[model samples]
Target chain A: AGNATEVPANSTVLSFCAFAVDAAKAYKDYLASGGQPITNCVKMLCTHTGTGQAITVTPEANMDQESFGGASCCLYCRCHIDHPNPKGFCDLKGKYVQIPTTCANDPVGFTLKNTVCTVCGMWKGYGCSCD
Target chain B: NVTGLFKDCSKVITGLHPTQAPTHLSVDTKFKTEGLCVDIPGIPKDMTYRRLISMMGFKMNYQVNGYPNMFITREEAIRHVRAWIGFDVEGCHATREAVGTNLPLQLGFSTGVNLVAVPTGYVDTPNNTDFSRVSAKPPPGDQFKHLIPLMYKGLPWNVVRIKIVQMLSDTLKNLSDRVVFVLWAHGFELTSMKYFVKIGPERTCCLCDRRATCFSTASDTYACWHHSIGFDYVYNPFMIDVQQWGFTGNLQSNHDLYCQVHGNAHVASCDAIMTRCLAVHECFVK
Candidate 1:
C-alpha cells in the first residue's frame, strides 16, 4: 500500500505543480474514457509496527518469496522438486525454481504443518529439511 | 405375614455404610407404599424374607460362578443356588442408581429399602467385589436381597444385556420367542448410546444398523439422545433407534455429561459427584 517514492514534508509549491500536472492528466484520461471522476483525494501516512520506515525503503522481497498467490520467479517455484528427493533440488540455481512447462501453479508444499524445506531444513517458513 | 416378610431387617442394615439412612435399616417407605408393599417391575411380589435372600444368591452365582459361597442358608430357596454351583449365570445385575430411581422400595417384611452404595467397574466378579468372596463369612443372607440391587449402575454392554435376556427367557421358558428387547434412554444420568432389541436371529450388520439408523458417525466416541440430529457422530452411524432404553438395550452405552463439570471451576467436594460409577455402554429392557 504505497507509491514508488516516499512522501516528504510540506513546503512544495513548484514541486506540487509538477506533481499536480501529471495527476490532472490521469484524471482527464479517466473522464475521457467515460469513467467516473474522483471528486476528492486524501493523503495520510502510517508506520509498520510503529516504525516510520517507508515501504519503498523496505528491502525488495526475495525473488523466491513463499506466498500462496505470489508470481513465481524465485526459488519458491515448484518446477524441479523431486518427490523422492524434493529437498535435493532446493536452491538448484533457477532451474528448480522455474515454472514447469507441463503444469502451472502446482506448489509442492507439505500438506501438514511443521514440514520444512528439503535442502535447507527450512523451506517456505514451515519446518523443512534439505535431507 | 408382616413378620414373615421382614424376618431379617437387622441383618440388611449391617452391610450398609454407617450413615443416617433409613431404608438401609428397614423398609420404611416405597413408591406408593401406604401399608402393604405393592408390586413393581423387575421386583417380584410374594417376597418372603427367605425368597429375598435367595434372590441375592441367584445374583451372586450369576455374577461369579463356582465359588464356595459363604452365604449358606436355612431355606430351600437358598438350596436352589447351591444346587446349581456348576454353571456361571449372572444374577440380575442391579445398581444403586437403579434401585434409587423414581422412588424407594417398600418391603412387606421390613420398613423400607434405601440404597447405600454402588459398585464400580463393569462385570465385577467375586474375585474383585462381593463381601462373601473377599471375606470368609459372606454378608448375611437377608442383606443380599437389597444388596444385589446395588451392583450395577446402568445397563451393561450389549453382550451382557443379551445374556440377561437369554437367562430371563430361559427362566420364563414360555413366550421366550416373544421376548422383544429395547434400550431405555435414562436421559443423560445413565447411558449415551442408543440401543434396540429384537427376537429372531438376523444378519449382524442389520442389528448393528437397527441401533445406528438415525446416527451419523462423524467422529463421536460418546453419544447423547440428541445425537440423532444434524450433527455427524464419529461412528457416522446409520441405524435405527429404539426408545425407553434403560437397564436393557442393544447398544451398550453409559451416560456422559451427567453432572460433568469442565474447565476451571471447583464446586466443593460435596457438590461434585464422588460416588463409585458404572459406565455401561449398552442397555436393553424387555
Candidate 2:
C-alpha cells in the first residue's frame, strides 16, 4: 500500500498496482539474467509460430497509423515495402512471418531459405507480447 | 397659484408636460409627498424637492472641483447627480437606466442643451473651404491602425514569463511599498506564483490524495483525471479557438469590475488587474 489513501481490494487502482508490481518484477528478473537493454523508442514484440521465440524490434514511423484500420500488410516479415529493405523476397507472401532467435539479424532474406511463415488471424497477427 | 406657475413653465419648456393638480402649495408640503417643485422636462415626477436641491448642490460642487466634493459622505447623492448630468459614476449609467427608463430623459435634456450651446462667434464652414484641413486623403481603415499584439501571440512560454514579470515590475516600481499584497485569479495563479515566487513534476492530487496524472497551470495544482474537473492544463484564458476552461466566471467579473472603476478596458491590463483583484476580493469579501 502507498502512503496516500487506502483503496478497496477490488478497485481498479489496486488492479493497476498489482499489474505494475508484477511487470516490474519480471523486468528486473529479465535484466538480472543479462537481457539486452530495451531502447526507449517505440518497440513491437513478434513471436515465431514454429519455434515460439519472441523478438522485440523498433517499429517504423507511422506504423500505428498504418496498422490501424485493418490494412492487409505483412507486419512481421521485414520483406514488406514499409521495412528498410523492401525488395527482399518472402516465400510466405501473404502470411505473417516470425523470425527465430538464430535468424534475428536478417529475418526477411532468411525467410526465403527458412520456412518461418504462419497463417494466423489478423487480430492475433501483431502485438507487444511483453505487456 | 403654484399649479398655474408650473402650467405656464410647461408651455415654454419643450418636452415638459403640464402639471396636474393635487399639487401641494408649500415646498414643505411637496417635500413630505416627495413631489417635484415643477413639472420640469427629464425630471422624475415623484422626485422630492429636497432630493432635487441636494442633486443641484452636488452638481455645483462637481462643476467647481471636477468631482463631487461630498463623495465620501454622500456617494449616492453624487452618483445620482452625475447620472442626471449624463456623467456615469463607476460605470453605473447602465444600472441607473435599468432601474428606471426615465434616466434617459435627463440624458436627452443634457444632450439637447449641449447641441443648442454653439459658440457665439462660431460659423459653420465647408470641409473643402477650411484652411486647417491637413489631409485631403481619406482616413486609414482599421487594418492600417496599430494594435498591440496579444500577450501570447507567437511567443514562447519563457518570453511570456519575461513580459509578465516586466509589466509587474514596472507597475510595482511606480507604486508604494504599502501595496504589498499580490492577488491572482484562478487561471493565472500558476504564472503569478512562478514569476513572483520561484517554485513541479508528476504530483499527487492536492485535494483527493490520489495519483495525479493531470496538472492545472491555472491554479498551480494537481489532481487525478477523475478529480481534475475544472482544471485548465494549458492556462490560456483568452484563447477562444481552444477550450476556454481557464477563463472562469470570477475572473470575468474581476475584469468587468476593473473596467468599471478605471473607466478603460484592455486585455493585457485587465489580465494583470484580474490577478490583483482576486487577492482584493479574497481579503475584503471573505
Candidate 3:
C-alpha cells in the first residue's frame, strides 16, 4: 500500500516543452489506436497530464492568455481533476509556476513562450509543494 | 385538461395585463369577445391547447440530471444545425436605391444547435455612404472611407439581402449531399426562412432562440451565458473560463475586436451564437 510522505522542500523543475512533446506523442498514439472521435482527444491528453506520475504535469490555475503568440495556448492547456480526493496520492497540492523558457515551436506546432505550468504531485493530491 | 390549460393561459395574460381579470375564462368563449377575452394566434392544428401551454410553460429544470427530451442527440443536432447559415446586413434601414447598388454586408456560418461563429467576410460599401456604417469608430486601413453608417438613409439593405442569398447558394454548391446550409437572427426568422426556401429545401434549416429558458441538468453539460445564470454549471468541457472565451479584453474592447474581425455587429452576434451552439453540442455529446 502507498503511504503519504513529506512535501519536498525544493521545487521540482521540468521542461514544459519536453512534457508537451511527450503529451503530443501520446496524443498521436491515442489517435492511431482509433480514439473514436477527435473531440475527446484533448480531454484525454489533459487527464493524462494531470496524473503527474507519467511525464509529470499538473492542471493550470488559470486558462486565459495569449502566450506563445497563440490566443488559445493557455486555453488548450487548462485541465481539471474531478475526483473525491482531488489531492490524490500526492503530499503537495498543485501550484501554478511561471517558468522562463525560450519561445520555440512545440511538438504540436504551437509556440511555447511565457507559459504557465502546474507543479504538483504524481496523483491528483500528491508530490510538489503548495506550502 | 383544457380547463387547466386555460387557467395557465389566464395566469400568463393577467400577469401581463394586471387590470384584466380572466376569472370566468373558458375555451367556449370566442376570441372576438371584447371583455375579459384574448386572442392567442399561431396554435398548430396537430397540437392541443394543453400541450402547447405545457411546452411553453416548461422551464429548464436545472436540478434534474441528464439531457432533456426537448433537445435532440448530438448527431441529430449537428444535422439540424448544419442545415442553416447566417448573415448580418448593416445599414438595412437605408433606401432601396443605395442598398440596391452594392452596400457593405457581413456573412457567416453557424453549425450545431447552439450558434458557432466561423470566420466572417465583408462586402465593401461606397465611399459616399459613410453615414451607413454601423461602427462608431472607423474600420482599419482604406476600407474606412468606403463604410456606410447603419443609420445612413441611402445605404442599401436589399442589395445586401440578395448578396446573402448568393453567398448561401454558393456555399451550398460546394458541400456534398450529407452537408447543407441554414440561417438565423432574432425576429428575422421569416427572412431566414425565406432564404431557406429560396436556396433549396433539400438543404433544410433551423433558427436558434437566444433567450431560451430551457437548460440541461447534467453536470457534464457545457452551459452558455443563458444557462450559466441561476444554476451550478460548467461553461465548457475544456475548463476554459467564460470570461476568457473572447479576446482577453474589456466588454467594449471585445466588441471592437469582434467588429474588426467580423466586420459588423450582426456577424459579431453570430459569433456569440456559434459558441452557444458548440456548447449545446458538447452538452449533448457528454
Candidate 4:
C-alpha cells in the first residue's frame, strides 16, 4: 500500500503519497523549477506522445473534392475543421493532459463512434489520445 | 553479398497490400547505424525468408519525425508493430494493436524484436537514373529501430539514427539521454500474441537469460550493473504492452526511473548502451 488521502463520498482520492512534476514549457522556466540542466534521463518512464481521450475519428462527411471519407482535414487544404477541442478530448487543442490510470471507458476507449480511424493518417499530430 | 538469405527475390510483391505472401524483411532499425544492419539474430539457419518476415513484421519507412502514412493498411502495419517487445507487457504502440489479433511472440525481449529486426533499404529512382533528385530515391530506413545492415539496397541503422536524431533533436535534446526505451517481453505475452516465440539471444545454450528461446519461464534475471547509463531495460509497464497480464501485472516501463529522476552518478547504475553498442540492440557494460 502507498499514501492515502481523504475526500468526499463521491470524490475519488488517488495516490498514497505525492510529488510535484515540472510542467514549465520554457527551458529557463524548467530550469528554475529545479530541473537539472541536463537533457534526457535514462531512468524516467515519461510518456513520449501527448495524452488525450480519443473521441470519434469521424469519417470525412459530404465533401466537394473528388476525394472524401475518413479525413478530418479541412476541405482541400489537409487541415481539420473543429475547435481546439475535437469532438472528444478536453478543450485544450494540441496540448497534453494527464489522467488517472484508473479511468476506464466502455469496451476500452478506441471503439467509440468517432474514436479512431486510419484516415488523415494514423497516430499523427491529428492527435494521439489515451484513456 | 550472398552471406545471408536476405537476397532471395520475392515474386509476389508489386505494391504493399494486405494478405500477401511472406516478403523478406528489408532492414534492421533504419539501416542507418553501424552493425545495426546485422542479420536478425536467433533466427534458425534453416528457416525460409517468408517465415522470417512473418515471424517479425515487414520493415516499412517510418521514422522519428515524419508522420506515418496511415492511408497504408492499418492491419498490415499492425502485423509488424504487434510483434514488438512490449505488446503484452508495456502495451506500447505495438502491443496496443495486438488486442484482437491474439498473436503474441512471447520470449525474452518483446520490445527487442521491433527495436532490432526491421531492415532498411533505398529504392532506386525511376529508370534507375537521376542521382540529382535526392527525395526521389526511396527513403532509406526500416521500421525497426535497430542499426543493422540491409540485405537488398537499403540504409543501415547507423545512418538512419544519425539523421532521424537530427530531425527528432528539437523534440529530444540528447537522444541517448532522452530516449527512454523498454523491451517488455515474456513467454506468457508471446503465447497470447500468436505464432512468434522468444528464443535464445544467441544460438547455442545461451544461458545468458531465459529458459529456452520460445518459452517465457525465467531462469535468471539480468540487472545492469548500474542504472546510470541508458539501455533499453527489458521490462513492462502497468498499462502498456503486458496489460494483458492484467493492470496489476509485473509492469516496468521506466528505463531506470530512479536514475533518471535522481541522476545518481555515484550509484551502481545500469549500462549506458554507449556508441560502440549504438549500431545494434544488445549493449555491453561500461
B1-286 per-residue lDDT for model 2 (tens digits): 1111111111111221112111122112222223222222353332221110000000101111111121222223222222111111000011110111000111011111111110011000110001110111111355312221221122333333333333323333233211122222222221122111211122456777654433444566755534545543311111010012244565446446434553323223343334344433333453
On the 0 to 100 scale, the lDDT of residue A38 in model 3 is 16
In candidate 4, what are the lDDT values of residues A1-131, reduced to their tens digit? 11111112101000000000111122223233443332110011223232233321211111111111111111100011111222322221111112222321111111111233244322333244333
Model 3 CA deviation exceeding 4 Å by range: A1-131, B1-74, B79-148, B153-158, B178-286
Deviation in Å, model 3, residue B91 alpha carbon: 8.5
Find the 10 residues in a row with the least total lDDT in model 3 chain B: B50-59
Candidate 3 versus the native: TM-score?
A: 0.22
Q: Write the per-residue lDDT of candidate 3 for residues A1-131, one digit (tens) a residue.
A: 11111111100101111112123332333334433211101111111122323121232212221111111122122111111233322111111121112211221222121222355422222233455
Over the stretch B1-286, how does candidate 3's per-residue lDDT look in tens digits?
1211111211122121100111222112332234322223332111111100110111111111221222123355455443334323221211212111122233344421122111111211110001122222223355444333322323143333333334433444334222222222222222222111111001111123222211222332222222233222111111111233333643334445333443333343455444344333343445
TM-score of chain A of 3: 0.19
The top-ranked prediction according to TM-score is: 3
What is the CA-based DockQ of model 4? 0.01
Report the candidate with higher DockQ, 1 versus 4: 4
Candidate 2 - chain A - TM: 0.23
Order of candidate numbers by lDDT, starting with the best: 3, 2, 1, 4
TM-score of chain A of each: 0.15, 0.23, 0.19, 0.16
Off by over 4 Å in 1: A1-126, B1-145, B148-158, B161-189, B192-286
The all-Cα superposition gives candidate 2 an RMSD in Å to the true structure of 33.7
